[PDB]
Amino acid sequence: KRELNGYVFISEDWRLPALGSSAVPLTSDFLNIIYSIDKEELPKAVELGVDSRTKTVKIFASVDKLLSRHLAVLGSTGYGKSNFNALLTRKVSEKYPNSRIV
Amino acid sequence: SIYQGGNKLNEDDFRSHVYSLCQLDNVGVLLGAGASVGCGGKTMKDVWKSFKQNYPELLGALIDKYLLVSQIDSDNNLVNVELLIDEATKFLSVAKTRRCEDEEEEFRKILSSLYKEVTKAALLTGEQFREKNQGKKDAFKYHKELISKLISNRQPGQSAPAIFTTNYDLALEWAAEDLGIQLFNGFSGLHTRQFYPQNFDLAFRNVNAGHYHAYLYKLHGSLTWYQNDSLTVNEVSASQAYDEYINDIINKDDFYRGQHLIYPGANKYSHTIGFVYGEMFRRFGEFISKPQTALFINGFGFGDYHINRIILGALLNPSFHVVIYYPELKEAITKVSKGGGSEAEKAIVTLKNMAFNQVTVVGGGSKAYFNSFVEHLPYPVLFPRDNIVDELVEAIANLS
Amino acid sequence: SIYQGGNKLNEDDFRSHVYSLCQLDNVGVLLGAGASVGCGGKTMKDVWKSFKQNYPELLGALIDKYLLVSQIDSDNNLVNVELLIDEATKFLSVAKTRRCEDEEEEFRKILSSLYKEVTKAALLTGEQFREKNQGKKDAFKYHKELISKLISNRQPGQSAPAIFTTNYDLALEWAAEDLGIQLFNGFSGLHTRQFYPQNFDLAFRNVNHYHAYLYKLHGSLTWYQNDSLTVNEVSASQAYDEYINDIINKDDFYRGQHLIYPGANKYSHTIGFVYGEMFRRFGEFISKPQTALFINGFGFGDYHINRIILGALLNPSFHVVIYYPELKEAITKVSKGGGSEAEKAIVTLKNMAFNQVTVVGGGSKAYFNSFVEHLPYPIVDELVEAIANL
Numbered sequence: 096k097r098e099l100n101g102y103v104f105i106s107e108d109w110r111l112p113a114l115g116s117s118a119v120p121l122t123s124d125f126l127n128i129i130y131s132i133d134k135e136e137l138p139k140a141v142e143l144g145v146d147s148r149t150k151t152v153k154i155f156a157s158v159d160k161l162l163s164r165h166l167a168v169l170g171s172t173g174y175g176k177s178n179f180n181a182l183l184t185r186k187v188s189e190k191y192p193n194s195r196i197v
Numbered sequence: 198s199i200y201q202g203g204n205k206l207n208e209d210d211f212r213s214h215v216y217s218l219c220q221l222d223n224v225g226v227l228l229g230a231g232a233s234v235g236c237g238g239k240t241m242k243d244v245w246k247s248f249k250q251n252y253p254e255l256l257g258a259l260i261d262k263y264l265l266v267s268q269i270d271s272d273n274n275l276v277n278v279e280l281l282i283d284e285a286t287k288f289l290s291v292a293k294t295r296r297c298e299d300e301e302e303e304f305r306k307i308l309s310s311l312y313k314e315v316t317k318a319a320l321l322t323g324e325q326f327r328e329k330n331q332g333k334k335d336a337f338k339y340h341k342e343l344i345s346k347l348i349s350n351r352q353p354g355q356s357a358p359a360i361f362t363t364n365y366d367l368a369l370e371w372a373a374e375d376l377g378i379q380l381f382n383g384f385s386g387l388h389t390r391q392f393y394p395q396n397f398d399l400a401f402r403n404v405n406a407g408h409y410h411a412y413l414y415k416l417h418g419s420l421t422w423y424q425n426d427s428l429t430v431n432e433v434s435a436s437q438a439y440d441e442y443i444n445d446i447i448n449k450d451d452f453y454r455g456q457h458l459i460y461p462g463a464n465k466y467s468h469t470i471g472f473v474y475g476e477m478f479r480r481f482g483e484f485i486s487k488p489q490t491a492l493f494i495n496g497f498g499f500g501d502y503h504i505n506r507i508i509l510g511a512l513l514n515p516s517f518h519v520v521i522y523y524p525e526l527k528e529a530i531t532k533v534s535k536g537g538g539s540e541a542e543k544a545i546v547t548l549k550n551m552a553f554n555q556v557t558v559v560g561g562g563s564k565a566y567f568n569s570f571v572e573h574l575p576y577p578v579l580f581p582r583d584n585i586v587d588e589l590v591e592a593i594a595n596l597s
Numbered sequence: 598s599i600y601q602g603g604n605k606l607n608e609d610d611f612r613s614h615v616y617s618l619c620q621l622d623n624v625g626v627l628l629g630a631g632a633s634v635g636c637g638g639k640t641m642k643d644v645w646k647s648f649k650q651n652y653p654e655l656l657g658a659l660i661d662k663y664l665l666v667s668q669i670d671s672d673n674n675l676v677n678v679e680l681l682i683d684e685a686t687k688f689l690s691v692a693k694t695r696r697c698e699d700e701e702e703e704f705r706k707i708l709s710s711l712y713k714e715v716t717k718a719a720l721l722t723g724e725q726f727r728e729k730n731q732g733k734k735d736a737f738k739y740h741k742e743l744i745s746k747l748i749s750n751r752q753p754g755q756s757a758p759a760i761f762t763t764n765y766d767l768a769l770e771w772a773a774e775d776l777g778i779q780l781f782n783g784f785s786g787l788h789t790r791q792f793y794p795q796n797f798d799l800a801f802r803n804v805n806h807y808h809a810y811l812y813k814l815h816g817s818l819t820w821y822q823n824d825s826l827t828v829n830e831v832s833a834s835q836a837y838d839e840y841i842n843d844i845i846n847k848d849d850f851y852r853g854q855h856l857i858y859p860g861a862n863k864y865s866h867t868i869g870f871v872y873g874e875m876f877r878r879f880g881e882f883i884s885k886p887q888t889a890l891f892i893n894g895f896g897f898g899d900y901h902i903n904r905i906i907l908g909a910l911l912n913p914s915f916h917v918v919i920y921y922p923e924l925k926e927a928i929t930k931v932s933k934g935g936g937s938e939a940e941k942a943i944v945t946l947k948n949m950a951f952n953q954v955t956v957v958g959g960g961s962k963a964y965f966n967s968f969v970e971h972l973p974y975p976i977v978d979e980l981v982e983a984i985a986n987l
């Protein structure tokens with residue numbers, strides 16, 4: 096959509112198109128809008144990585160939506176369970192020195 | 198001040214209604230004379246003021262002898278100027294046959310004064326009327342937005358848009374000619390251009406590789422239309438009209454030809470000239486009586502009986518929806534609720550008070566204008582709000 | 598007292614059976630001189646009262662000289678009147694065929710009074726009979742609802758509703774003309790309107806509406822016969838100026854073999870055609886399967902209708918729903934020797950042992966107005982007044 100001065104992505108699976116339409120590709124600007132968050136929460140956002148199919152977009156997440164309830168990290172041996180904790184933990188400390196972690 | 202059925206609304210319930218309304222089968226627009234004030238035009242009372250300033254001697258032979266106008270209206274500036282020229286043409290035509298030479302001069306001399314005053318107010322650019330590319334100037338910036346937004350949101354298998362208007366000026370044409378759009382107005386040809394009413398039913402189509410076109414209905418006429426021989430009506434270009442007749446009108450004095458012009462609704466008693474005016478109202482009704490229809494109004498003062506009749510009759514069909522813009526609701530509600538106001542106020546008010554969820558009125562002075570109507574209409578997604586074209590054309594022209 | 602064939606029910610037990618019977622293919626309704634009271638009608642008894650206490654002097658010959666009526670039922674105020682009219686027409690015809698004077702005049706004097714008292718009751722609005730839009734009024738408010746819902750409760754590809762009638766007035770026409778639906782009665786034309794029986798087999802259809810049929814059983818006020826042997830229909834504004842006004846405001850004048858109401862001149866091979874062609878359609882509608890028939894207003898004083906509705910019940914998919922207000926007043930009289938066929942038949946019906954006969958009684962809760970409400974359900978004025986004044 097397009098509302099006031101930018102775009103927003105709704106996630107509801109019912110707007111089937113009409114015949115004689117025209118299909119088009121998606122550029123690298125209609126893709127951030129999809130894999131992006133609100134822009135008032137940027138002060139409360141941390142960077143984790145990028146998209147793996149293209150390796151162009153960056154992914155951000157809200158701290159007060161991650162660490163509100165509990166969080167599950169699952170994975171077999173030798174694939175990176177301990178390289179994501181030392182990354183999610185040395186960031187909240189650099190952003191909120193008034194925080195208790197154990 | 199927004200009202201739907203008497204009750205009030207908020208901007209976010211209104212903007213979410215306009216979008217639902219613009220997705221329907223048939224869509225339309227009806228403009229007026231105020232829409233053309235942001236370009237260099239005028240209003241019907243600002244015309245009468247200038248008439249009775251410069252010509253106060255002919256203003257007695259028109260209220261005393263022939264009974265053509267009333268003093269209350271002449272004082273309050275509430276005269277219809279498109280309904281008086283017709284009557285004067287009737288008088289002159291009668292006098293020609295009755296052979297009363299004492300009465301033809303006194304009508305030529307007061308028609309030459311009315312046409313000179315209504316023409317001057319419709320050029321919109323003065324002496325730069327006969328030149329080219331007058332749609333690039335910034336005065337015509339929203340007339341383009343209107344067209345582009347009306348077109349850019351339609352789907353395959355959906356009728357094209359229509360635009361009715363009471364003005365007799367060239368703004369929409371000057372704008373479409375610069376966007377690269379085509380408008381159908383009932384004419385065909387270049388060396389002899391003639392009226393064919395059977396081609397409001399046509400459309401375009403592509404062979405191998407189209408839907409950039411719209412319909413325009415002008416209800417009172419235009420300065421580029423005229424009549425040379427008994428049976429036909431011709432259209433010309435601005436540069437050609439200015440050189441044929443539109444110049445003597447302004448500069449020369451005591452110049453009047455006869456039944457030669459088709460603006461505004463003047464020579465309505467012939468049978469080759471009213472055939473042109475009637476088809477428009479015909480098609481207006483035939484459009485306003487379809488199912489799943491929506492109509493936006495802006496710039497219209499509601500001083501006509503037949504159009505109001507048509508609209509009120511149309512509102513019986515449950516699938517017709519309307520939207521109106523009148524920036525004097527407050528200044529009229531009281532003037533009509535105390536003792537009474539004027540027919541326009543009474544009519545416009547009768548609609549505010551009903552149990553209808555398919556009517557709507559809008560006020561707020563400078564908040565119900567054209568530059569703000571053009572902004573409540575949704576803007577598409579893929580349409581580019583960026584111009585990397587001119588930076589390339591500049592380099593192409595700089596190359597040397 | 599919702600008796601249902603040797604049992605008893607309640608309001609909803611009835612109000613669901615009706616919804617069940619409304620889904621059938623063949624739906625039919627039957628109406629008599631009862632449902633016409635709310636609009637200004639009179640039963641068969643009031644007209645006899647009026648004739649008695651308005652034309653007493655000539656009432657004797659009917660009992661002393663010609664023996665058309667019985668003094669007992671005359672006093673009891675239960676006497677059939679249209680059969681009397683029919684027979685008097687026969688007497689007049691014989692006395693005019695053989696050239697005799699006194700018996701001719703003596704019957705030309707009686708026909709007038711009878712037709713007068715029988716027309717006044719059916720005018721139904723006084724002197725607003727020769728005027729327009731008489732269906733916008735308030736008396737004709739429940740017929741419109743009846744039609745609207747009986748039509749709306751239909752499936753696509755289904756048959757059309759059937760309405761039989763024993764009255765001879767214009768209410769169901771005035772009402773449909775207000776709604777905007779098309780009725781079929783077997784007539785066609787405007788400047789010369791004629792009878793075509795095979796028109797009952799037609800039906801409309803669209804190319805890019807809804808309608809119904811109407812079977813009268815006793816005629817109407819707007820049908821008549823001219824010097825040539827064809828039967829014509831006419832509008833009220835025209836009939837009023839043609840004959841009715843004189844009927845109601847002249848003391849002695851008669852035109853024989855002209856009018857068609859009520860079962861009067863059946864001894865003419867041109868007039869009995871149009872009567873028989875209705876009863877045989879009634880029969881052929883009954884004999885169909887998956888049919889329902891709602892009876893509201895009829896007094897069951899007819900040999901032939903009784904016989905037909907009786908024989909109709911052998912095959913099981915024909916449902917009947919009678920309405921009868923004064924039921925216990927007859928249950929408590931059949932115990933003794935006194936009783937009339939009207940009540941004997943209805944008690945015999947309620948004394949059955951299958952779930953089709955569904956007699957109903959509430960004294961005043963078995964009436965047309967409640968009959969209507971028992972059924973399911975599926976700004977113009979302001980705008981038109983605004984346009985008017987504008």
Ligand SMILES: Nc1ncnc2c1ncn2[C@@H]1O[C@H](COP(=O)(O)OP(=O)(O)OC[C@H]2O[C@H](O)[C@H](O)[C@@H]2O)[C@@H](O)[C@H]1O
Nearest residue numbers: 229230231232234240241363496497498500501524566567
């Ligand atoms: N910038 C603006 N934007 C929008 N509306 C405006 C603006 N400025 C003024 N207005 C409104 O524009 C209106 C000006 O009304 P008038 O020009 O006299 O009426 P007409 O052009 O329909 O006159 C032609 C008719 O007259 C005969 O009856 C024939 O039948 C014709 O149909 C005011 O209400 C202003 O509030």
Ligand SMILES: Nc1ncnc2c1ncn2[C@@H]1O[C@H](COP(=O)(O)OP(=O)(O)OC[C@H]2O[C@H](O)[C@H](O)[C@@H]2O)[C@@H](O)[C@H]1O
Nearest residue numbers: 629630631634640641677894895896898899922963964965
């Ligand atoms: N408002 C009302 N709503 C419903 N029913 C009513 C109402 N008022 C009275 N009734 C009932 O309406 C009934 C009136 O009965 P009658 O008018 O004598 O019978 P008919 O109209 O079939 O007479 C025509 C026959 O006469 C010849 O014999 C021919 O053969 C005809 O077939 C009463 O029982 C009331 O309970």
Ligand SMILES: Nc1ncnc2c1ncn2[C@@H]1O[C@H](COP(=O)(O)OP(=O)(O)OP(O)(O)=S)[C@@H](O)[C@H]1O
Nearest residue numbers: 144169170171172173174175176177178179180181
């Ligand atoms: N995103 C990454 N980029 C580069 N190397 C990675 C990445 N994720 C994991 N690795 C490598 O994977 C190796 C082992 O991963 P570990 O951190 O041991 O995961 P793990 O063994 O599942 O976690 P444990 O069992 O709690 S020690 C390390 O040497 C990392 O260098």
